[PDB]
């Protein structure tokens, strides 16, 4: 006669930051571009839930963990990762003929 409800929650927050410096320059035929940069990245995750069995009234309105009479379980965890990134680029074109 099982009845239960699991109230699940999840969070994902990801933030990012960069700085970038670019320099372009044109001398008759020669065109050139340089660029340097950096980018920190982070993501933090977390989830968790509440489970409970046995409910007198089998409707979503009734079936919240507060209203259950059987046993309960509690779940949840989190994970995350971070990324650092350094980069550069150099573009050059002789006579719109050689890139």
């Amino acid at each position: 006669g099982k009845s239960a409800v699991e109230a699940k929650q999840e969070h994902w927050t990801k933030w990012m930051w960069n700085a970038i410096a670019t320099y372009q320059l044109e001398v008759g035929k020669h065109r050139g571009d340089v660029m340097i940069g950096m980018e920190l990245n982070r993501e933090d995750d977390s989830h968790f839930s509440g489970y409970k069995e046995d409910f007198s009234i089998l409707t979503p309105d009734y079936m919240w963990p507060d209203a259950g009479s059987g046993t309960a379980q509690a779940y949840g965890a989190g994970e995350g990762y971070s990324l650092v990134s350094f980069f550069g680029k150099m573009n050059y074109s002789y006579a719109d003929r050689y890139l």
């Binding site: 950096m38 920190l40 982070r42 933090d44 965890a77 989190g78 994970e79 995350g80 990762y81 971070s82 650092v84």
Partner: peptide, 13 residues
Amino acid sequence: CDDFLDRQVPQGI
């Protein structure tokens, strides 16, 4: 920016 790559620790283990 290398102290930054070490901050996050395994959770729940």
